[PDB]
Design a protein around this ligand. Structure first.
Ligand SMILES: CC(=O)Nc1ccncc1C
Length: 460
């Protein structure tokens, strides 16, 4: 039974509008409807992992699990295993996997974050799940962010609170938030970003949707515009949107957008919007390909339509050598030349680096760097040829070239991280000096850069 090199992952997000689902929801799991849809020839082929995020979910965990599992069994004739389920209020995440994967999946974590204070604490936030699939770490976040067209800044703040405070993955990676803990991170939900056009343009927008002409709407989508301005979701990818806005529909049809202000909306307009989204972030030079991204047309219980996305994702095996795990492999080493951090900080403390990777027995602290002033005001922290030589547990290039080094630059004064990034060991050559680079972030905002050269020695 060979271990897989690649799996497929289904991501679903649905704001159920506090209504039970209809009797058949199979179109969701088949990626059928509008947008980038899955080929009919794949209908009976199960995805390896199904991750279902709901918002405004009125069902008990048991009720929803029975619907999901019976849906997948009808499609695939496979009885899926429940990996995890976690609910905060009416925000839920379910992870299901093919039974063959049960003994490939370990280190399952769940968490939630509640967003806002007082007034604004009580129904918005996120749930998430992480686990290891053989040698690959996977994270999944379902968030229901603040509603309303004039609250994009609140949504961005909700995003920053969720990635700071959601405690998933390896707790030993203490300087790193969820945006650095996983080989593949999927972030989805009712993110509630709107099409920011004048209220008076509602019927014009509906016309454009009927013509399947999305370009002049997407140019005003708040998630795309905020992400282009580095206000939210920095370093996350999204597949091009080619499906109609998924909100706000009259229930029991899809023929009508319900946009006008009502007492039930707090006298707010809900112009047609792409509230319901799937984004991802994978470590550099790991295979990840979006195969589908769309919405269903035939599930009409809610004022939102379900959204699906599917991915091919590279995975690695749980590697054992004669040496590591349990010792180092002296045939392996990672060296750093001409390295320096450029930081945006106005502060003047000394900095050191920490190197974290599951290819090391434990994280490695460098000596302090030498601070200089950049020509445009910046702090440059020079490590020159001073960084430690990293001793991987396994030297086999089929293992080592698939690994990644997380880097934190920390203040000597406070031991607080000022920036985090990631370097792939998937190099063009071994025993050769090659440029490396990562942006540095802190709380998912850009704080600087790390660049230099690497020299990787493997057993080959
Ligand atoms: C066009 C655009 O917004 N790109 C982007 C922004 C932030 N982070 C990642 C990406 C790929």
């Amino acid at each position: 039974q060979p271990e897989p090199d690649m799996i497929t992952i289904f991501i679903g997000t649905w704001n159920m509008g506090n209504a039970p689902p209809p009797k058949k929801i199979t179109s969701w799991f088949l990626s059928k409807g509008q947008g980038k849809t899955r080929d009919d020839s794949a209908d009976y082929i199960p995805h390896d992992i199904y991750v279902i995020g709901t918002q405004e979910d009125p069902l008990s965990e048991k009720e929803w699990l029975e619907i999901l599992k019976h849906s997948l069994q009808e499609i695939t004739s496979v009885t899926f295993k429940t990996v995890a389920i976690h609910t905060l209020w009416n925000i839920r995440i379910v992870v299901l996997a093919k039974p063959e994967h049960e003994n490939r999946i370990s280190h399952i974590c769940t968490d939630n974050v509640k967003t806002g204070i007082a007034n604004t604490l009580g129904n918005k936030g996120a749930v998430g799940v992480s686990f290891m699939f053989n040698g690959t770490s996977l994270g999944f976040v379902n968030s229901h962010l603040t509603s309303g067209s004039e609250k994009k800044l609140r949504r961005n703040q909700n995003y920053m609170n969720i990635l700071r405070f959601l405690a998933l993955g390896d707790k030993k990676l203490s300087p790193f938030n969820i945006t650095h803990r996983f080989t593949h991170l999927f972030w989805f939900g009712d993110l509630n970003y709107r099409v920011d056009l004048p209220t008076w343009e509602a019927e014009t927008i509906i016309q454009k949707i009927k013509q399947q002409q999305y370009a002049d709407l997407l140019s005003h989508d708040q998630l795309l515009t905020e992400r282009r301005e580095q206000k939210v979701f920095l370093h996350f990818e999204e597949e091009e949107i080619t499906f109609a806005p998924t909100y706000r529909f009259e229930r029991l049809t899809r023929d009508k957008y319900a946009y006008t202000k009502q007492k039930a909306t707090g006298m707010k307009y809900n112009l047609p919007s792409w509230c319901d989204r799937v984004l991802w972030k994978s470590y550099p030079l790991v295979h990840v390909v979006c195969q589908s991204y769309g919405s269903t047309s035939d599930i009409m219980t809610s004022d939102h339509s379900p959204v699906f996305a599917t991915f091919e994702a590279g995975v690695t095996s749980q590697f054992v050598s004669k040496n590591g795990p349990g010792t180092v492999d002296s045939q392996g080493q990672i060296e750093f030349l001409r390295c320096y951090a450029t930081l945006k900080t106005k502060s003047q403390t000394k900095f050191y680096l920490e190197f974290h990777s599951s290819c090391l027995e434990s994280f490695v602290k460098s000596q302090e760097g030498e601070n200089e002033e950049g020509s445009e005001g910046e702090l440059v922290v020079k490590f020159g040829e001073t960084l430690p030589k990293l001793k991987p547990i396994i030297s086999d290039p089929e293992y080592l070239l698939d690994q990644h080094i997380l880097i934190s630059i920390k203040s000597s004064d406070s031991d607080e991280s000022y920036g985090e990034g990631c370097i792939a060991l998937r190099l063009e050559a071994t025993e050769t000096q090659l440029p490396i680079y990562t942006p540095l972030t802190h709380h998912g905002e850009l704080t600087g850069h790390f660049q230099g050269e690497i020299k990787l020695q493997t057993s080959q």
